[PDB]
Amino acid sequence: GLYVEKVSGLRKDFIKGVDVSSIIALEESGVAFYNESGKKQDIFKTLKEAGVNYVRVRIWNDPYDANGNGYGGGNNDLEKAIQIGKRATANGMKLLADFHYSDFWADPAKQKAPKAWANLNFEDKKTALYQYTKQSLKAMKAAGIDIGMVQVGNETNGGLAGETDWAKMSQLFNAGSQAVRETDSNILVALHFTNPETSGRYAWIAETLHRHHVDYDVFASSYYPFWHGTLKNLTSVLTSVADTYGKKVMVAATSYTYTAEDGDGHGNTAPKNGQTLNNPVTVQGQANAVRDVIQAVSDVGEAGIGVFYWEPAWIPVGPAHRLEKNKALWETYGSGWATSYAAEYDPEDAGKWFGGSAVDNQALFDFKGRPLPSLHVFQYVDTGTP
Ligand SMILES: OC[C@H]1O[C@@H](O[C@@H]2[C@H](O)[C@@H](O)[C@H](O[C@@H]3[C@H](O)[C@@H](O)[C@H](O)O[C@@H]3CO)O[C@@H]2CO)[C@H](O)[C@@H](O)[C@H]1O
Ligand SMILES: [Ca+2]
Numbered sequence: 603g604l605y606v607e608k609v610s611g612l613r614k615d616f617i618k619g620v621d622v623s624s625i626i627a628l629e630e631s632g633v634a635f636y637n638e639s640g641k642k643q644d645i646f647k648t649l650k651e652a653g654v655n656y657v658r659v660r661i662w663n664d665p666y667d668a669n670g671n672g673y674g675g676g677n678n679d680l681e682k683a684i685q686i687g688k689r690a691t692a693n694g695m696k697l698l699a700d701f702h703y704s705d706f707w708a709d710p711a712k713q714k715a716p717k718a719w720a721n722l723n724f725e726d727k728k729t730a731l732y733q734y735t736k737q738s739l740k741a742m743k744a745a746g747i748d749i750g751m752v753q754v755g756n757e758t759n760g761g762l763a764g765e766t767d768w769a770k771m772s773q774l775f776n777a778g779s780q781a782v783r784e785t786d787s788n789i790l791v792a793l794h795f796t797n798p799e800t801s802g803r804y805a806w807i808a809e810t811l812h813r814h815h816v817d818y819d820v821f822a823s824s825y826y827p828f829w830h831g832t833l834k835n836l837t838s839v840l841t842s843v844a845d846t847y848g849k850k851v852m853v854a855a856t857s858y859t860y861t862a863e864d865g866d867g868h869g870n871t872a873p874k875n876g877q878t879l880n881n882p883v884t885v886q887g888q889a890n891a892v893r894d895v896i897q898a899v900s901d902v903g904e905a906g907i908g909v910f911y912w913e914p915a916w917i918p919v920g921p922a923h924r925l926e927k928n929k930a931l932w933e934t935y936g937s938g939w940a941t942s943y944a945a946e947y948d949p950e951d952a953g954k955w956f957g958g959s960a961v962d963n964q965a966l967f968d969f970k971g972r973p974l975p976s977l978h979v980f981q982y983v984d985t986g987t988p
Contacts, residue, residue: 604975606889608986609897616900617852617908618980619656619698620649624676624916624959626685627937631919635971645915646693648973653980656750657690658698658854658910659683663716663734664705665936666943672936673706673944674956680738687747696750698792698910699742700854701778703731703763706940706947708756710796714947715764724770728777731763735781743785751790753854754778757824759795759803772814779817791817794854796824799831804839808847820907821847822854825895828877833898844905851905855912857964858891859883860976865969866918867925868938868958888966889976896983914966914977916959921969932958 625645635645646657661683665673676682687697702708705716719727735754742749754775755762762771779791793816795807808821821843825836840851862883864870873883881887892911899906919931919938932938938958945953962969966977 604886604889604978604982605987606893606979606982609893609900609983612896612900612983616896617656617910618654619658619908619910620654620914621658621660621700621855621910621912622649622915623658623660623678623682623686624913624937626682627674627676627935628915628917628919631931631935631937633917633919633937633971635915635967636973638973640972644689646689646695650693650695652973652977654695656696656698656908656910657686658700659686660700660702660756661738662702662705664718667946671943672941673947673952674932674936674941675707675939675944677936680741683738684742684745684747687742687749688745691746691748696748697742698751698753698854699739699749700753700756700794701735701738702756703734703774703778706944706952708758710757710759712948712951713758713761713763713766717947719763724765727763728773731774732777732781735778736784739781739785749786749789751792751820752778752782753792753794753822754782754818756794757796758793759797768810769814772811772816775811775816775818783817790819790850792820792822792852792854793818794822794824797830798823798825798836798839799829804843808843808849812847818849820850820852822852824855825853826855826857827880827891828872828874833894836895837898837901840899840906841902844902849905850907851899851902852907853895853899853909855910856892856895857912857914857961858888859963860885860888860965860974861963863963864922865962866920866958867922867928868960870963871960872964885974885976888964888974889979892976892979893983911966913961913964916961917965917967917971918959918962918969928958
């Protein structure tokens with residue numbers, strides 16, 4: 603069925619990554635994954651066979667209330683990062699450790715200090731950040747994990763760990779980078795931004811990072827085609843960073859919709875009125891979208907090192923008609939994007955929107971955990987379809 607056009611100029615060592623941070627909370631909710639032969643299999647094995655070479659995991663400092671009730675979103679702490687890391691390593695895939703330096707979702711709107719850092723002055727918060735990263739990386743190495751890359755922050759467009767001043771953010775970037783450098787010289791340090799479509803944003807950020815002497819290897823970007831402008835633009839803003847500053851570049855988070863259907867009863871992020879949808883909302887469309895983002899980063903040349911698909915397997919804990927039954931699983935295991943317990947930390951967003959998966963229709967597995975044809979995109983970019 604599926605067609606993929608060969609990506610031209612694609613380097614043989616290109617990073618083909620997935621962020622599957624929700625996997626632990628989902629397996630705990632009784633969710634199962636399959637190979638294309640239709641038998642139960644560890645998702646990491648199926649990912650490997652599909653030609654994935656890299657796993658990304660989000661790390662929240664303390665994603666739990668005082669009583670240890672998970673904030674949800676996969677309840678992603680260091681302990682789960684090690685679980686995920688061990689499995690990735692066991693399956694021949696390198697790890698990208700994605701430190702949010704927050705107790706919950708870090709994005710362009712939300713960059714809240716971890717609860718433990720809330721009353722620290724800047725010096726002490728900075729050494730806490732450095733100390734946390736170093737300790738976290740030591741634990742992962744101790745677990746035998748193959749770490750390829752560390753992301754110091756996540757979509758830090760406007761802040762980091764409670765800080766909004768770019769001179770302060772830069773010192774924080776350097777605190778984390780320092781920990782990585784001390785751990786292993788071979789680990790790539792990524793910084794991760796989003797909204798590449800914004801006029802002169804990435805030029806400004808890269809210049810600011812340079813002026814503040816931030817030590818990093820990779821300038822990473824999000825790319826969701828619904829809001830983030832053109833592939834031509836993406837290539838262009840990343841090429842400018844690569845050429846001007848001598849940085850590697852990559853896409854740290856990308857996805858597309860394979861269906862318009864909501865598989866679990868919790869409203870999905872996309873597709874929606876007003877979003878740019880250049881591809882059909884189908885398995886083929888989804889594969890086109892992934893192949894094209896890979897093309898756009900490859901087109902950067904030497905410096906374009908990879909693409910990570912964000913959450914290819916945040917599938918339903920159960921069908922949409924059993925919404926209220928699903929809610930119990932989301933609430934107990936944190937297998938939706940947020941639980942009600944996160945209202946303490948994030949009242950404005952998680953407080954009003956808490957629930958299930960907002961991205962089940964952007965998975966590369968169906969609602970029942972079988973791989974979609976579009977999962978083959980990681981192999982077929984090298985060769986094209988027959
Ligand atoms: O469910 C339909 C509604 O979804 C709302 O989106 C919610 C939050 O506003 C949104 O921030 C959250 O996104 C999560 C996280 O904050 C973000 O950084 C990451 O990329 O995605 C996470 C979810 O996968 O998602 C929830 C979804 O309930 C919309 O704001 C609203 O318009 C409506 O469609
Ligand atoms: Ca949903």
